[PDB]
Amino acid sequence: PTVSDLECKITECTYASDFGGIATVAYKSSKAGNCPIHSPSGVAVIKEN
Amino acid sequence: RDKGAPLNDVAPFGCSIALEPLRAENCAVGSIPISIDIPDAAFTRISET
Numbered sequence: 001p002t003v004s005d006l007e008c009k010i011t012e013c014t015y016a017s018d019f020g021g022i023a024t025v026a027y028k029s030s031k032a033g034n035c036p037i038h039s040p041s042g043v044a045v046i047k048e049n
Numbered sequence: 050r051d052k053g054a055p056l057n058d059v060a061p062f063g064c065s066i067a068l069e070p071l072r073a074e075n076c077a078v079g080s081i082p083i084s085i086d087i088p089d090a091a092f093t094r095i096s097e098t
Binding site for chain 2 (some may be wrong): 011012022
């Protein structure tokens with residue numbers, strides 16, 4: 001699925017080591033299925049691939 | 050019969066009395082710096098509310 005026309009926002013970001021940072025994402029898909037994710041910036045490390 | 054009145058009838062700042070451990074119950078005055086360590090198990094993680 002193409003996911004654009006979305007929105008992302010943190011909801012409780014934890015300024016920390018353990019994966020405490022969270023963020024809802026208003027996904028706006030075309031199909032329905034899986035969608036691999038990553039932050040190309042090294043600022044954020046994500047638990048979910 | 051020529052006494053004075055009782056401290057549970059003349060005290061200030063709101064107290065009651067007992068001939069018991071000599072407490073002065075329920076004295077409403079000032080503030081108390083209270084601090085608690087909650088059980089972390091009782092917390093709900095942020096991504097569930």
